[PDB]
Amino acid sequence: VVLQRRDWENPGVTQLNRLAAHPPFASWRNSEEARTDRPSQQLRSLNGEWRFAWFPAPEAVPESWLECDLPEADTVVVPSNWQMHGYDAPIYTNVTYPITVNPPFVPTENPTGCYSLTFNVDESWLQEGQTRIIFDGVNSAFHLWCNGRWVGYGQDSRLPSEFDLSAFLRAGENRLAVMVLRWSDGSYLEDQDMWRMSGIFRDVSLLHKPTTQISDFHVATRFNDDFSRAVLEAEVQMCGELRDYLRVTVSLWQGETQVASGTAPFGGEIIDERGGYADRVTLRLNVENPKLWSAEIPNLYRAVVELHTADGTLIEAEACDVGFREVRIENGLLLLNGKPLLIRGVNRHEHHPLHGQVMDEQTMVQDILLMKQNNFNAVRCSHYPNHPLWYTLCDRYGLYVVDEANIETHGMVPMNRLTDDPRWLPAMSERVTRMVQRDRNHPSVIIWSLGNESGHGANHDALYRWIKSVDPSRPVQYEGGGADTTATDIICPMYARVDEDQPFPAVPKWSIKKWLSLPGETRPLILCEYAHAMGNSLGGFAKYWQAFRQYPRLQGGFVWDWVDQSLIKYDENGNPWSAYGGDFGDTPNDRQFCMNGLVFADRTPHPALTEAKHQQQFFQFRLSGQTIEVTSEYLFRHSDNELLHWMVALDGKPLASGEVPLDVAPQGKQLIELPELPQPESAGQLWLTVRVVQPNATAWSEAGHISAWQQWRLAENLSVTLPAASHAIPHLTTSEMDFCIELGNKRWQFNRQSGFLSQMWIGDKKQLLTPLRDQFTRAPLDNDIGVAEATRIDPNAWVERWKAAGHYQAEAALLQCTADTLADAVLITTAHAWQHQGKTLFISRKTYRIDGSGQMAITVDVEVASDTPHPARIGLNCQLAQVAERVNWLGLGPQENYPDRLTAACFDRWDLPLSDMYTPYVFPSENGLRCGTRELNYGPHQWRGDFQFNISRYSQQQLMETSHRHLLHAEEGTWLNIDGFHMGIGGDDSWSPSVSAEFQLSAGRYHYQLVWCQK
Amino acid sequence: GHYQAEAALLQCTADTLADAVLITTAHAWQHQGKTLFISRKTYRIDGSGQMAITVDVEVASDTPHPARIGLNCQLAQVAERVNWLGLGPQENYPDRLTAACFDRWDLPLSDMYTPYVFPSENGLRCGTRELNYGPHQWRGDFQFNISRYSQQQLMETSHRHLLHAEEGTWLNIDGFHMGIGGDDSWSPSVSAEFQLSAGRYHYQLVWCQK
Ligand SMILES: O=C1O[C@H](CO)[C@H](O)[C@H](O)[C@H]1O
Ligand SMILES: [Mg+2]
Ligand SMILES: [Mg+2]
Ligand SMILES: [Mg+2]
Ligand SMILES: [Mg+2]
Ligand code: NA
Ligand code: NA
Ligand code: NA
Ligand code: NA
Ligand code: NA
């Protein structure tokens, strides 16, 4: 029947013999164990060592496997993705399906994973009650046998499938056989932009329930106008024989105190002409002054549901954590406990670099900690229901959750081909309804989502209404078909820009500000995805946050995304490296487009994370004279774990500092008058830096955690004092090929054919390995490349425009090189033109003035043809002979910063190891720039001015020629790129030009000045 | 103290090059001991009689952003026409120049003055690459006004009919000029992107004889 029916090529069959969905059960037989959420002896884990064999098709699986272990089978850990054990390749594709688009059919060659487990069942489990097996995640479809007998079938890779094994088991040893299909009709609804894997990748458990049992329960909390009174309403359903003596007791607990309790027999109210539910009961408990749940203060109660005889016999108990909170949209605003939310959100895939799509508690906790430490309060489950533990942790640690159905049909043409088709309504409905049935009691879930990138079909509208009907407590959102359809309560676009319209036909992405006020529009707007964090990205992040704060109805967004989907591979020597699309022989593939994270796969932060943290701060600051005004953006909590530190420094030199306790109400203000500020005699800019410090450790943070900062310029005293009269004067030696300048042991060489400074000497020591030359290009960022599908090339992409214009191939042509002897200096004047196919792209005119103090003043004036694509940078570069341990600078830092991503950086004196000045993006590009630098120190060298710089062992050429970071080699000496000017990095998306006009180098004429000297 | 700031000489040197003379200057404008602006210049006069002026200005970050960054002088000459390659033909300012077109414009001198009943700074033309007046030509990328009335007289005179033509011609040539605003006229109304807030400014001009 199995091979004959081909249930995996039939959307009308998504399960066989699968039990109804429900909230998490453990069947405690002791109420105290239920209350305290301790282990239940009635819920067993079958995680561990299983037998596994791989086959190329289900037709290749031998019948013998149903009753006997296959000798060729291996013993593997479960849960697991079998690609991670090397049985076949994981496939990274974005939009295009990994299989031929021919619904409902899948390939004949359909990788088949045969799992089996021989396991013990106690006699006591079989003498009474019901023994079920629960598969929390099987990707993508499976048949199940127990002791050679066929049990059932299941689809949907991301929700639990449960089966009654009572009639199949024997006391002692039993054998399960699970046949997992890689591809099924379910795969058409699972086209998420992620690695395509398969297997038994979530927990497997065995649950014992009594014959008379709790089969479902729903918890709701409703409130009066000021939230000083609540009613908890618990609906409980039973299965078994109905009897007069049966009762349900629901008890509610605030830690160790029972705050409320209610007991009732079964028999619901009359609902229609045929009566009511005799197998259900609703308990209503009054709660005065409930402690409310939010991400800020995740107050939780425990609800215990006891099924019992009236005279006191507990049959079984179930339980959940209860968060007292109201979610509603009123007058166009999303409210949590009557207050408008500001969503500091991120999308988070379930991804581990070693284990693939298998999740563990440690990784989940690590992620939540890092998120909260970086000022996130919300997470979107892109794009499927998560491992059940995720919700428990979000409940307890406090994060707002968008729970999203496992439906994505991106690769369909058009996108709604399946979702507008009623033949596909049953399969879609199960992915939505079974999510709701499972997760509806979690307070952390505040919004339901219908899926992702499946267009807008009638099936979406039907399922939107289904949720609205069954669960009025939570808004429903869905972005497909233009982000503002009749299937969404929230305008939830992806990559809509702040100010710029993107008027695509049918599905425009309006400026978010404009979107709110379109005729007839009243809904709130929260971006489901924004600020695409691919590689060197998050340019213009502050622009979103300014808009969010100014516009009541712009209530935030979810950054895309949390973590790079890179996977670990090993080289010849067994050394690990980060791999992306195509690295497993997977083809077609979308290469690096799977890496979009604010953190690397091992959870090491990208530089972008600090920009996110800074913009997502909960305290706002204004400066008026000596007055600092602190404003809290908290809705509920006081600043009861917050101290304000302040420091005033003159060009990095500390002049004063102190601390002031913060006592700020939610949404309130506090004025801090700074003491009489000292007047520095010395020249320079005074800078004020403030930081909010948390003196006490929390569940999510260490003592001393910095949660917020800001800087201001204070007084500036411009230097008017003259540099000391240098007694010596530099000697010019003129030859046919060189202009050589000497002053003591210092020597400079300017090549007369090239027109560049080709060498410097300190004593007899060479200082340069490559000459100091202008550079107008950068090793392209992923945003410059502007690709989302590897087959596609956008002629509009910055890298394409630069390449076509000849920026990367333009050669320096010398126009002028002269030397003049001054009264206290030697002056070298140069002019160069950069040309491609007879077209002059750039002209550089320079003076080098070396005086008797040993300093070399470099003045550069550059012309850029108005019709050439604006250049990536305007600066100089050289390869120094020096390799030094440290980099010291007075500029913005300490982390990597670019013109459109530098708000988080602070102006101070920074000192770091050379390695910290390189950002190891897995796909190499221009990296590690620091902006607003007035002084740079490296080895014996010092540069002064007002410039941007990066410094590393890797040239721009190597970076642009290398696809993987692990293939980079340290070059001789150190490559230095010093920029007068540098283009924004953008990132509003990574598949179209996204650098805003104000960050493009469009001025045509540029001036900058550097002083190079020794110290 | 912007209107009463006094120029203090920091540096004034002269050098001879292979085909030119180079004059280097530095000035500080101060008020009550506070240095508001520093102007560093080079004047390069070559064998073709062209005087290349390079100007680099520091503006104290805590002083209000200045109305303009430029040079002014009273020319001995009165000439009939003003001819320029830049935005025109009418008066235009950084935040009010979209109507203006880049072209070669030639007007009588009197049209380079706008007779606002209450006198103020007026007649500026932006985005100018070449200006011609009598024997003089200025080249660069600048804003300018040219008229018989000094900035001093304009600020001291309440009514246009009370203005008297001064000897010769007042020329104001700006590397940079602040927006004029106008969202209202009773509060600061110049948008941030039109305020002269960069701290360090660079402009260059060539003065020659035509
Ligand atoms: O539109 C999207 O942008 C992301 C780009 O990485 C990713 O593909 C998301 O799954 C998708 O919803
Ligand atoms: Mg099927
Ligand atoms: Mg009791
Ligand atoms: Mg997609
Ligand atoms: Mg700041
Ligand atoms: Na808002
Ligand atoms: Na992606
Ligand atoms: Na406090
Ligand atoms: Na690269
Ligand atoms: Na006046």
Swiss-Prot record, chain A:
Location of the active site: 453 (proton donor), 529 (nucleophile)
HAMAP family given in the database record: Beta_gal
Induction or repression: By allolactose.
Matching InterPro entries: B-gal_small/dom_5, Bact_Beta-galactosidase, Beta-gal/glucu_dom_sf, Gal_mutarotase_sf_dom, Galactose-bd-like_sf, GH-type_carb-bd, Glyco_hydro_2, Glyco_hydro_2_AS
Annotated residues for binding of Mg(2+) 1: 408, 410, 453
Binding-site positions, Na(+): 193, 593, 596
GO cellular component, one term: beta-galactosidase complex
Cofactors: Mg(2+); Mn(2+); Na(+)
Result when mutating residue 593 to A: Decreases the stability of the loop 794-804
Catalysed reaction, written as an equation: Hydrolysis of terminal non-reducing beta-D-galactose residues in beta-D-galactosides
Gene name of this polypeptide: lacZ
Name of this protein: Beta-galactosidase
Record-stated family: Belongs to the glycosyl hydrolase 2 family.
Molecular-function GO term, any one: alkali metal ion binding
Pfam families: Bgal_small_N, Glyco_hydro_2, Glyco_hydro_2_C, Glyco_hydro_2_N, LacZ_4
